[model samples]
Every structure is written in structure tokens, then in C-alpha cells.
Target: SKGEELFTGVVPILVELDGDVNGHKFSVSGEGEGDATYGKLTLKFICTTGKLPVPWPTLVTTFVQCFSRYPDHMKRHDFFKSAMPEGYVQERTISFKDDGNYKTRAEVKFEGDTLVNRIELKGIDFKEDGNILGHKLEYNYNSHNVYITADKQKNGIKANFKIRHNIEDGSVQLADHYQQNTPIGDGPVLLPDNHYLSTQSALSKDPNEKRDHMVLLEFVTAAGITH
Candidate 1:
């Protein structure tokens, strides 16, 4: 088997929140890189939000902990020390001014069977009509063995997408939920000579409901990989 080609360099990630959350605009920004392999993602993010009902600090902390390994998971909780010495994780607080005094209680619930802890992606097939540098491109794949952790929870959730593809084979791992530390977007799949595939999973059943509590992540793949 050919050794896994290193997918090094900056892998851009854009995390944005859609819809109104009591008229507060939460700012989410981060930069991350892949260490030799695509699976080993080292991301640093800062989420700033006005005092809201949700426990963002704890939520972000629990999500990052899903990776559960060094390098792959370097961000520390707002109240905890660095995962490593001289770490980059820091604290951020947002103060916003809105004319209306909004007082409402909303519970974001996860859809589907609560008892099901995981869902398997049994080579499920799908296609995407894509474009690259001004050229139209299409991709289809009999997705490999990948599983998404669907641990049932309300108000709080922690899950990960474990793609069983070997890094050496050069497949892309698209992390739908931030909890899955896998690199986002079209990476290895962009290669002209590979049957590599990627997955972009969604957390909600209805697109309308998604707007209420949506975590939009935009992926910007590195240019050097195409050369």
C-alpha cells in the first residue's frame, strides 16, 4: 500500500451562527492545521456570545473533549488550564446592546431516536455537483465505513464522526458537528486521480428547525494540495 501522503498546512474553518438568538450576534472564529495526517486536527477557536440561556463555555468544552486525544484535541475549557504547556486556548466574553429586553426559554432538542447511541454509514452513496477554480466538477462515492455518535441528550450534546478510512488512502473527513474534530470540506476528494470521498452530515431533520439553532461551518481547503 502507498504510504499516506501528508496533508499539511492551514485548513481554514468558518463557524457562524444563523438566525436570531435574542438579537445577539455570536462571533465564532478559528484556525487549525492537519499534522501529517488528515485526522490529527489541531484547531484553536474563540467563541464570544452575550449572556444567554445556553451554557456555551461548558457546551464548547464538552464538544472539544469528544476528540479525546492530544493534538487532535488541544483546546481547553474556559475554566480549565491548557491541555498542553503554553497552550493557545483563552477566555472571551461578549457584551452586546439590544433595545428590546428579550425574555424567553427555548429548548433545542436533538431529533430522531434518543436511545440510539450511534448511526452507521454503510457505504451510503451520494453525489455532489461541485466546482474548482472555475471548472465544474462532480463527485460520487460509495461511502466507506463511518459511524456518527448520536448519544441522546437534551440541551447538551457530545458526539463524533469516526471515519474508518485509512489516512494513507487519502480520503476527506467532513465534520458536520463541531464535536467531530475531523477536518472540514473538500480536501483529499479534490485530487484528480483518486476515488476518495467525504461526508457532510447534518444534525437536524427540518431545515427550518435548523435555522433556530444552526452551526454553519464553511471549509476552505489548502491550495498547495492541488499542485
Candidate 2:
């Protein structure tokens, strides 16, 4: 039942309630697998107010702009636009399988910035596989009345982001094989490794080799979720 425990640890409970103005409430609840390397993360969201006409656009815009400071996301305009939702704020929970079990949490909140709009994030966490070469990831984002430029070229938007990592984790060694300057499409582009550097570098290598240790890990980013 180890798999079952892992599933339960990663799976989250979601609830939705009808709200004013055609809006709805959303919530998530769950726990991690309690593994030293991998654990579960549960999240919840409730839209207590009226519904907006373009929920997806708004959400996508907000989410993308929030992470605009990151180089990888800069060219992912279509990716963000396609991932937005309409008239609903959905609840999502992601499970991270850390090879080395470490307790992590993360949160981001936006307080109505005329410049970038406003939202709030309460709980957040980050972790990696058990390799000492990997990173220790921790992050948080909270701001008020701050302007966020929608433009990808000019004004580089800056939100709050942090990574607590130990580069010595054996996982970091995988990065050496990753490829660079490769064009990736939308909708959960697959990568050889889930960790950061290795995945990026693996993109340029031959996709057919099975012995490549890089092939052991899979990375995906989609619908405001990454694993």
C-alpha cells in the first residue's frame, strides 16, 4: 500500500460553492507522503465575490505577470494565455516527489495593484529529489499597489521568488547534459529531468537513449501546475 499512501498524500480534496455574481468558491485539502524525498501538497481557492467575464485571461495575465521576472517564462506568452481560465478560479494541488524528503511550503498574495492587479497566496513550499547536488527551494510573493507591466520586452515585471537549494545534491550533476536554445511548445512539454538545470540541458540531446540517467526524471509545466 505504499503507492496508495503516496497517492493519498499527493491527492487533494477540492470543494466548490456557488457565490454571488455567478462566481464560485473553491478549496483544497490534503497532506504530503511524509517521505524524506517526496511529499504531498494541498491547496484551496475560493472566489467569494462576483464572477468576471474573462476569468482565464485575468488569471493567466496575473499569474504570468507575477512570474515575469523569470527568464524561462519571458518567451512563454502563448503558454500563459492558453493556460488561463474564464469566469472561475479553480483549486489545484501539486505533489512533489523529492528524492530527499524535506518539508517545504510557499505562498503568494497580490493586493490590488492598479499596475499589476492584486491577489493573495497563503501557503507555498518547494523541494527536490534526494541528490545533494540539487537546490533547496523556498519561495513567497506578496505586494500591494505595485504596478506590473504586461509587456514582455520593455518593463521586466518583478515579483517575489526564492530558491533554497544545496547545489551539492547529486541531482545537480544531471544538469551537465541538458541542451540549450531549444524551442518548446505549449501544454506540458516533457523534459528528461524534473530538477531545474538537467531538464533544460537535456532538451538538446538525443531523445532515444534509454541508458541516459537523465531519462529517469520527467518535468511538466501546465495549467499553473509544475511537477
Which pairs of residues collide in candidate 1? 4-168
Off by over 4 Å in 1: 1-25, 36-38, 49-53, 57-227
Per-residue accuracy of model 2 over 3-96 as CA lDDT, tens digit each: 1112222222222222111122322221111111222112222233433221211121122111221123322422222222211121222122
Shift in Å, residue 86, candidate 2: 11
Error of 1 at 125 (Å): 32
Clashes (N, CA, C under 3 Å) per candidate: 1, 47
- Find the 10 residues in a row with the least total lDDT in model 1: 115-124
Count of backbone collisions in candidate 1: 1
Candidate 2 residue-wise lDDT at 166: 21
Every model's Cα RMSD, please?
20.0, 21.6
Residue 8's C-alpha lDDT in candidate 2?
Answer: 21
